[PDB]
Amino acid sequence: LPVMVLFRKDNDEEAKKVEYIVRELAQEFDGLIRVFYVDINKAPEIAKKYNITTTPTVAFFHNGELKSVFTGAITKDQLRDEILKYLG
């Protein structure tokens, strides 16, 4: 399954909308993708590995490889279109 990972900071107002969007897509594509939520402060080594410095950031992985990274202003349509790409 393709994987979508939300990198988040705890007290972040814009991160709230992206977290809603990601959870919405997680349900919409349940069973077809896996979604993980990484707290930058609780897991700094993962954020460091993936060069995550701003939050919210959403990354996509497939076949154990990093495929794309979205930062800054993030929309549901952007994320959904990536999900569809890796589903075929």
Residue numbers in the entry: 18 to 105
Task: Copy out sentences from the published article reporting this entry, exactly as the authors wrote them.
This had a high stability with a folding energy of −48 kJ/mol. Crystal structures of stabilized variants showed small perturbations in helices 1 and 2, which rendered them closer in structure to the redesign template.
We therefore introduced the 15 substitutions predicted to be most stabilizing by the GMMA into the isolated edF106 protein to measure their individual as well as combined effects on thermodynamic stability. Thus, only nine could be combined to form the multi-mutant 9 (MM9) variant. All the same, the MM9 variant had a stability of −68.6 ± 1.1 kJ/mol (ΔΔG = −21.8 ± 1.1 kJ/mol, n = 5) and an extrapolated melting temperature of 152°C ± 10°C (n = 5). To gain more insight into the effects of the mutations, we crystalized and determined the crystal structure of MM9 using diffraction data that extended to a resolution at 1.9 Å. However, there was no visible electron density to fit the N-proximal residues (1–17). The crystals grew very slowly, typically within a month, with a low success rate out of 48 examined crystallization conditions. Only one or two would yield crystals indicative of a conformational change taking place in order to stabilize the crystal lattice. The structure also revealed that the destabilizing substitution E54Y presented in MM9, but not in eMM9, would probably be incompatible with the native conformation of Val2, which may have facilitated its increased dynamics following MM9 crystal formation.
